[PDB]
Structure formats: structure tokens, C-alpha cells
Design goal:
Length: 326
DNA sequence: CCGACAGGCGCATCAG
DNA sequence: CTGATGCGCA
DNA sequence: GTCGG
């Protein structure tokens, strides 16, 4: 809230570039700016003051100038009244409709929740589930409920095979008091970078979670990654809990820390960490950290036995999950 | 100035 | 059918 | 939209 007006403003423009301009690099640029301003511990008095931050430049500065003086932004007022823009922006709030489909729907006269709800035959499976649980997917998950979802998931995973480890990552592991969804990192000794000795390792976990009515829906599902919906059981004469987005990723056990670094986030922390490693001659994915030879070719994986080790290689002081939030 | 800008899984489509 | 490209999302 | 080489 310190520069809340400013970071709200920038985030809105970020969402505009992504969903309407389909300009993914302007999106990121505005998000980087937002991020850096949020962490800045003085009430910003001018654009010039903000320009001294990395990722804030000439044009965001002018925008901050206009906002400080008048309390709003002309470019945004216009965007707020452009019907098309607002309609394309709204439809992307549905899980499974990105900038492209949203623009296609709006060209065909589909602009509202009602339009969607009586054109189910035009949506793919994912888009349909997102529509179905549209309101639920935008409620946040209190940490108390995340703690119950974690208990179910670990216990059921345990029940399929005691050798599995499941770790709830995302904002939950960063200690947040509320979460947007649930991210589960799954490992098992039969799946490593060198061999897959059992098949259905992810499937059997999903199947067990569906069997106890915890996973209610499936958005997509391959061998290593599941994306879907889950729900806590409710007691008698109570309202049902909202349905919730759940992601489960099966990662090679020997690449656990690159993996858990990756799903712990935040999204911008990773982007800033991958972007900083690139500048120091490495590349990081969910799997490995590798060096970069002059040609742009990735060297062979470096040894890693902790989250901390990854931070060393790119000359960063270890930051606890709590301190990786935006 | 002007080239990247993080990286990859699953689903969907298109050319052959 | 592969293989390549784009989308939506993590 | 921003940066740094
Ligand atoms: C979406 C996204 C996720 N990630 C990583 C980091 C995230 O912690 C993880 C998935 O987390 P998410 O499920 O996106 O949740 P979150 O960490 O954003 O927190 P919230 O629930 O409050 O929205 O994957 C990226 O590196 N880049 C991205 O763009
Ligand atoms: Ca700057
Ligand atoms: Ca969406
Ligand atoms: Ca999450
Ligand atoms: Ca997620
Ligand atoms: Ca029900």
C-alpha cells in the first residue's frame, strides 16, 4: 500500500499490454517496474525519483508524474471506457481463455458471462471448466484451508506409496496468509534424470485423489504435469467450499531443488533470477543449472545438493522463501 | 542504438 | 501419422 | 518499456 496507487496503475497497464496489445514484453516491463516500486521503502514524490530504480524508465516516469499530480492516468481512463478492450480483458479472467481466444470471442459477439454460458459449444474443455468455476477460481484460499488441503494430499499420496514425497510450494511455502491456488511438487525414487523405472507414477496419484473426491476436475494431464481442480470436503448443513485450482508436477528426484526453487516462486523472482543467471553465464530451469559457452550452447548440469547452492553460482545471498514474495 | 527479455508442459492446429 | 508452430499457463 | 554493451 505504500505506493499502491502507482503499482496498481502499472499493473493495470501490464494487464492491458498482455491481454489487449498482446505485447508480452511490455507486460513484463510493467510488472518488473511494479515489483521494484512495491519493495521501495519511501513514499515516491516524483517520477525522477522512481527513474533511479532499475526497470523504471522515461515513459513510466512521465506516467508516475501524471498520477502524482492528478490522481489518475489519461491513457487508462480511455482504456477503461473502450468497450472492446474491457470485454477482451474480462474474458481472459476465465481460466483457459488467453489474449488470443478472448479477441476471437469478442469479434463474434461473445462479450459477457451470459454469452459464454450459452455458447459452451465454442469453448474447449479447459475453458469450459474455468467458466464453470469462474467465481470460485477468483476467491483466494485462506492459509487454514491450504493446511487442510496439504494434509489430504500428503496422506493420500502416502497411501499410494510411502516412497513418494509431496511438497506444497507456491505462495504457501513463502508463508503467505492466503493463496491463489495449490502447487504440488511430487518426487519418487523410480523417476530420476537417468531412468523411469515405473510408469503411471503421476497417474496413480491423480486417480487416488479423484477416488476420494479431492480432485473433482482435470484441465490437462501428461506424464509429468497435472493441472486441475480440487475441493475440501464440507460438514453437514454447511455451504460447500469453493473449488480450487491445483497443479501437480512430477519432477526427477535428483533434480528436486532446482524443482522446488522453481515452484516456490514468485513468478517475478524466478524471472529476475533466471534473467540474472543469464547475465552471469548460466541457465536455470526447473531441472538443472547449466553454464553457457560463447555460442549460446548450454553446458552439462552443475552439481546441486541444496536450494542455497543455486543462489551461490549466480552470486546471490540466500533468500528464504518468505523473502521471495513480490 | 537495439537485441533480448525464462523456460517448458500439454493441448490444439496445420502441412505433408 | 510426424514435426513444427502457437496458445495458455506455470 | 527498459537496459547494457
Ligand atoms: C505463473 C508463473 C509461475 N512461476 C513459478 C513460480 C510460482 O511460485 C510457481 C507457481 O505458482 P502460482 O501457482 O502462480 O502461485 P503464486 O506463487 O503466484 O502465488 P499465488 O497463489 O498467490 O498466485 O511457478 C514462474 O516462475 N513464472 C510464472 O510466470
Ligand atoms: Ca532506471
Ligand atoms: Ca485466462
Ligand atoms: Ca500457487
Ligand atoms: Ca499454479
Ligand atoms: Ca457438489
Amino acid at each position: 500500500t505504500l505506493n499502491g496507487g502507482i503499482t496498481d496503475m502499472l499493473t493495470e497497464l501490464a494487464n492491458f499490454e498482455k491481454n489487449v496489445s498482446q505485447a508480452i514484453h511490455k507486460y513484463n516491463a510493467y510488472r518488473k517496474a511494479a515489483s521494484v516500486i512495491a519493495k521501495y521503502p519511501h513514499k515516491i514524490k516524483s517520477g525522477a525519483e522512481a527513474k533511479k530504480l532499475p526497470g523504471v524508465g522515461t515513459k513510466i516516469a512521465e506516467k508516475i508524474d501524471e498520477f502524482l499530480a492528478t490522481g489518475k492516468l489519461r491513457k487508462l481512463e480511455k482504456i477503461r471506457q473502450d468497450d472492446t478492450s474491457s470485454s477482451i480483458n474480462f474474458l481472459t479472467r476465465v481460466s483457459g481463455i488467453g489474449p488470443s481466444a478472448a479477441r476471437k470471442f469478442v469479434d463474434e459477439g461473445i462479450k459477457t458471462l451470459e454469452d459464454l454460458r450459452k455458447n459452451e459449444d465454442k469453448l474447449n474443455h479447459h475453458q469450459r471448466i474455468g467458466l464453470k468455476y469462474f467465481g470460485d477460481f477468483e476467491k483466494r484460499i485462506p492459509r487454514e484451508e491450504m493446511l487442510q488441503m496439504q494434509d489430504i494430499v500428503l496422506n493420500e499420496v502416502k497411501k499410494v506409496d510411502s516412497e513418494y514425497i509431496a511438497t506444497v510450494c507456491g505462495s504457501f511455502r513463502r508463508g503467505a496468509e492466503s493463496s491463489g491456488d495449490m502447487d504440488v511438487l511430487l518426487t519418487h525414487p523410480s523417476f530420476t534424470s537417468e531412468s523411469t523405472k515405473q510408469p503411471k507414477l503421476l497417474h496413480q496419484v491423480v486417480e487416488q485423489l479423484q477416488k476420494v473426491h479431492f480432485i473433482t476436475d482435470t484441465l490437462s494431464k501428461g506424464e509429468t504435469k497435472f493441472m486441475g481442480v480440487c475441493q475440501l470436503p464440507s460438514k453437514n448443513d454447511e455451504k460447500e467450499y469453493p473449488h480450487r485450482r491445483i497443479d501437480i508436477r512430477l519432477i526427477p528426484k535428483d533434480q528436486y531443488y532446482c524443482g522446488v526453487l522453481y515452484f516456490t516462486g514468485s513468478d517475478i523472482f524466478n524471472k529476475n533470477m533466471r534473467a540474472h543467471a543469464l547475465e552471469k553465464g548460466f541457465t536455470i530451469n526447473e531441472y538443472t543449472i547449466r553454464p553457457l559457452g560463447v555460442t549460446g550452447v548450454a553446458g552439462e548440469p552443475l552439481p546441486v545438493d541444496s536450494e542455497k547452492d543455486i543462489f551461490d553460482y549466480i552470486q546471490w545471498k540466500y533468500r528464504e522463501p518468505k523473502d521471495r514474495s513480490e
